[PDB]
Enzyme design. Structure first.
Site, PDB file in Angstrom:
ATOM      1  N   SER A   1       0.846  -1.236   0.000  1.00 55.37           N
ATOM      2  CA  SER A   1       0.000   0.000   0.000  1.00 55.37           C
ATOM      3  C   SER A   1       0.872   1.275   0.000  1.00 55.37           C
ATOM      4  CB  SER A   1      -0.988  -0.004   1.153  1.00 55.37           C
ATOM      5  OG  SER A   1      -2.122   0.760   0.854  1.00 55.37           O
TER       6      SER A   1
ATOM      7  N   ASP B   1     -10.065  -5.929  -2.866  1.00 56.07           N
ATOM      8  CA  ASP B   1      -9.436  -4.843  -2.088  1.00 56.07           C
ATOM      9  C   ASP B   1     -10.370  -3.625  -2.057  1.00 56.07           C
ATOM     10  OD1 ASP B   1      -7.735  -2.678  -1.324  1.00 56.07           O
ATOM     11  OD2 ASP B   1      -6.039  -3.830  -1.893  1.00 56.07           O
TER      12      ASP B   1
ATOM     13  N   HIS C   1      -7.260  -6.541   1.033  1.00 62.26           N
ATOM     14  CA  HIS C   1      -6.129  -5.626   1.127  1.00 62.26           C
ATOM     15  C   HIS C   1      -5.063  -6.081   2.115  1.00 62.26           C
ATOM     16  CE1 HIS C   1      -4.136  -1.794   0.538  1.00 62.26           C
ATOM     17  NE2 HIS C   1      -4.114  -1.565   1.839  1.00 62.26           N
TER      18      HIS C   1
END
Lengths: 281, 281
Positions: B148, B226, B259
């Protein structure tokens, strides 16, 4: 009823958390389930992993890295919680070594703990039959493992239920709870001060009389740097009792390893393979 | 100076946490180190893993299960923190997408962030040279990966420093921070309103002008479930830019994966193997 409250794809299977209304606890309980990719094609063996003091039903799922090995061998992983939650018993959360997060996998007989602290019956009966009724799990290929209070739990539940658990292993178990402070406090509170009533929940006592049908015996890993090795865990007491009884035990001692999940993660792959040799036979 | 504050044996190596007085940050910083067994007989290659928003130096060590793969391939793992800690900048902890836990791996130029929020220089220079001076790590065999905000970091740091990072991969990166709210807020705060200054920390802009190429390619894994895929990550923008510049990218999209670290754990073994192809040459 049965509620899926969390789900994450993981190693081509699914890591789930369920919530259900436990009739044995009398309260809602949460438990984790890993289903491997093979569960899509039929029922699979399962391992129950019991966590230690202060832990939850998600500790194992997050920290042990067991799902890859469950996926490789086609085994489901069931993770119960460590105690009832929100029972409203006075001061049930006053200490971290008793009560909330600290059920010790016994059926309490003393009030006010007897109403809800029935983790022995919950894990061996209600949770098991719920898993079998609602998930693709083989009733005849179940094993059990756990850590510390949970390793105590795994050994006790296996030795008392040969009809249910076909394989058992443990990481740093509380091996002789009658002879360490954690166990004596738990037993005094949940069971009363008659030590004879405690033997039914003490792995070192149970192994002296157990009649077992384990092909590869009982696997225990213990780290030698474990801060609790001499104060709480006492693996040597279980080792000596199992030797006198003729019970096969592979007690592996590892120099330098601690109590926690860096230690557990290192050996959980060998544990899943150990169980798979029985459960996937 | 260099203080060892945590150490646990893990997969026949050691999982450590160090504290040191950072000259670049101006404050103490914590970083994690996994040394594989092979580091006992010589220097090893190393992978830097950059964590995402709200994380710390230990998130990766606890949740990703990467040590098993690092021990198999003989790679050290270095995990920096995500921001300065305890800088005393007013309200630096007001929001979880900026400030504490949210350094975005940039060198801030705007006060009051410019004093301590120098995570770009910290990771690429001071932390690197501290690791090379004090740990058995090969200077010429370093790679970088992350998740991320850390996937943004890994791509940005690799594309800007090809003579440092020999391999690069990412999990669910913020691929075009100049065009998503997380990046626009962070860049505006740390760097000011001149959007041209943001291009040096935008993987999609950097790949358009990168002269040097990673001939083993760039590996990115993205889960299709996600929650930030369309609001913040925008992997398609980087893909389109890389395609147009001739930079090979393996962008793998996985149906159903989310995620977090159940997703990351699933693929991190393939990432360590991917890096080992170059770093263990």
């Amino acid at each position: 009823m049965l509620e899926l409250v969390e789900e994450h794809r993981c190693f081509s299977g699914v890591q789930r958390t369920y919530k259900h209304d436990s009739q044995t606890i009398g309260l809602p309980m949460r438990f984790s389930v890993f289903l491997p990719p093979q569960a899509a094609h039929g029922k699979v063996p399962a391992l129950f992993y019991l966590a230690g003091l202060t832990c939850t039903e998600e500790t194992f799922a997050i920290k042990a890295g067991a799902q890859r090995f469950a996926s490789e061998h086609g085994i489901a992983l069931i993770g119960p919680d460590t105690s009832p939650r929100g029972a409203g018993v006075p001061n049930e959360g006053a200490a971290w070594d008793f009560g909330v997060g600290a059920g010790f996998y016994v059926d309490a007989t003393q009030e006010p703990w007897a109403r809800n602290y029935r983790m022995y019956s919950y894990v061996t009966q209600e949770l098991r039959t719920t898993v079998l009724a609602e998930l693709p799990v083989r009733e005849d290929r179940l094993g059990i493992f756990g850590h510390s209070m949970g390793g105590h739990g795994a050994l006790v539940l296996a030795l008392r239920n040969p009809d249910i658990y076909k394989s058992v292993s443990a990481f740093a178990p509380i091996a002789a709870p009658s002879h360490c402070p954690w166990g004596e406090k738990a037993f005094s509170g949940y069971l009363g001060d008659d030590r004879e009533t405690w033997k039914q929940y003490d792995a070192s006592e149970l192994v002296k009389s157990a009649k077992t049908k384990f092909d590869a015996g009982i696997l225990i890993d213990q780290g030698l740097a474990d801060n609790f090795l001499a104060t709480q865990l006492h693996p040597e007491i279980f080792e000596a009792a199992a030797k006198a009884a003729g019970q096969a035990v592979t007690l592996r001692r590892h120099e330098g390893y601690d109590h926690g999940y860096y230690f557990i993660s290192t050996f959980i792959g060998e544990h899943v393979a150990f169980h798979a040799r029985t459960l996937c036979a």
